[PDB]
Amino acid sequence: ELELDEQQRKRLEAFLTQKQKVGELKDDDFEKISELGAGNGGVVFKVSHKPSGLVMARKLIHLEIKPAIRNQIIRELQVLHECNSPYIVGFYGAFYSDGEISICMEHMDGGSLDQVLKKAGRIPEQILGKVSIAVIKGLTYLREKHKIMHRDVKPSNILVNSRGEIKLCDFGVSGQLIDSMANSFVGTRSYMSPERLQGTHYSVQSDIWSMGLSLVEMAVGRYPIPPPDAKELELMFGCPMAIFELLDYIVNEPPPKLPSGVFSLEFQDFVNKCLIKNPAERADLKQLMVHAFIKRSDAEEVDFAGWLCSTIGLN
Numbered sequence: 001e002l003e004l005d006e007q008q009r010k011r012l013e014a015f016l017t018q019k020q021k022v023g024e025l026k027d028d029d030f031e032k033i034s035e036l037g038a039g040n041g042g043v044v045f046k047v048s049h050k051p052s053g054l055v056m057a058r059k060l061i062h063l064e065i066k067p068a069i070r071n072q073i074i075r076e077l078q079v080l081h082e083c084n085s086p087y088i089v090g091f092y093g094a095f096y097s098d099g100e101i102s103i104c105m106e107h108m109d110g111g112s113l114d115q116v117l118k119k120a121g122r123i124p125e126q127i128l129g130k131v132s133i134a135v136i137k138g139l140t141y142l143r144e145k146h147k148i149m150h151r152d153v154k155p156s157n158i159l160v161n162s163r164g165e166i167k168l169c170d171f172g173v174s175g176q177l178i179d180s181m182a183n184s185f186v187g188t189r190s191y192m193s194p195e196r197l198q199g200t201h202y203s204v205q206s207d208i209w210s211m212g213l214s215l216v217e218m219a220v221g222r223y224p225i226p227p228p229d230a231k232e233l234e235l236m237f238g239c240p241m242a243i244f245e246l247l248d249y250i251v252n253e254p255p256p257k258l259p260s261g262v263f264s265l266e267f268q269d270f271v272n273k274c275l276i277k278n279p280a281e282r283a284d285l286k287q288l289m290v291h292a293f294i295k296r297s298d299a300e301e302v303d304f305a306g307w308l309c310s311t312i313g314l315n
């Protein structure tokens with residue numbers, strides 16, 4: 001499931017060839033083009049690396065820390081230079097400058113799936129089949145080639161582009177950065193598995209739940225917890241809870257599911273197997289890769305790029 005297409009292999013080759021010409025990244029070599037998005041951890045700008053002429057996405061994490069800590073962080077992120085896959089956002093490098101850690105990556109012109117969702121209303125099942133394939137393959141790559149687990153799968157961490165690529169980003173690789181960030185920074189816990197919210201099971205299975213939950217949100221066009229009444233559903237396909245309550249709901253109530261009738265039974269089964277509360281019963285990456293929904297989607301000739309460009313107005 002990690003074999004590379006001819007077009008894929010060629011795209012990875014080109015990326016590295018370009019990266020090789022870059023050299024050490026420095027604050028002054030960047031020119032701001034526009035803001036891509038934010039978060040309570042840092043901001044992301046579309047930038048131009050003046051010397052190379054390469055356009056990148058630059059994430060800035062404001063951190064007031066000693067020269068020792070930051071230098072360790074920069075060291076830890078170097079691991080990102082080895083994560084090369086068609087399902088992982090490209091990495092250029094990381095550096096520190098005047099109170100901010102910079103993480104430079106390949107720019108994905110389609111933005112994140114949370115942004116795409118906002119614009120589409122809801123994402124079609126066939127499109128979600130391609131998204132599912134990408135995410136599974138991305139997690140498989142991380143686990144297999146780097147023994148790494150994502151830890152933060154969610155719609156804003158899945159990026160897409162006009163080329164039809166779907167890639168994962170923001171997977172924790174620097175423990176030090178996490179700590180220092182844990183301060184005034186804390187990302188949503190709304191996509192975390194019940195076991196992780198219970199301090200219990202902590203593995204790749206947890207990322208599978210997050211993916212399953214993200215898929216339901218995108219299919220229905222709303223964070224699926226708590227479930228939509230019969231009233232909302234009828235207006236959606238014709239056919240506010242506090243964060244702490246949300247987390248309790250997730251741990252104590254049955255997992256969400258897709259509405260019946262409007263989605264194929266294979267898609268419903270796939271999300272169901274991703275969302276089983278008990279991590280042991282929950283399907284694993286190997287099983288998902290051969291699930292009927294994945295086999296079917298993999299065989300479908302879906303023009304994701306075409307759909308994407310028309311949906312967000314690129315085109």
Ligand SMILES: Nc1ncnc2c1ncn2[C@@H]1O[C@H](COP(=O)(O)OP(=O)(O)O)[C@@H](O)[C@H]1O
Nearest residue numbers: 036037038039042044057105106107108112156
């Ligand atoms: N390589 C990238 N290309 C294009 N947009 C990106 C890229 N990396 C991040 N973004 C955008 O920046 C937004 C903010 O990213 P981030 O700081 O990690 O916060 P969050 O994931 O909580 O949204 C993302 O939601 C996405 O829209």
Ligand SMILES: [Ca+2]
Nearest residue numbers: 027028097098
């Ligand atoms: Ca400077």
Ligand SMILES: [Mg+2]
Nearest residue numbers: 156157169170
């Ligand atoms: Mg992110």
Ligand code: NA
Nearest residue numbers: 027028097098
């Ligand atoms: Na600067």
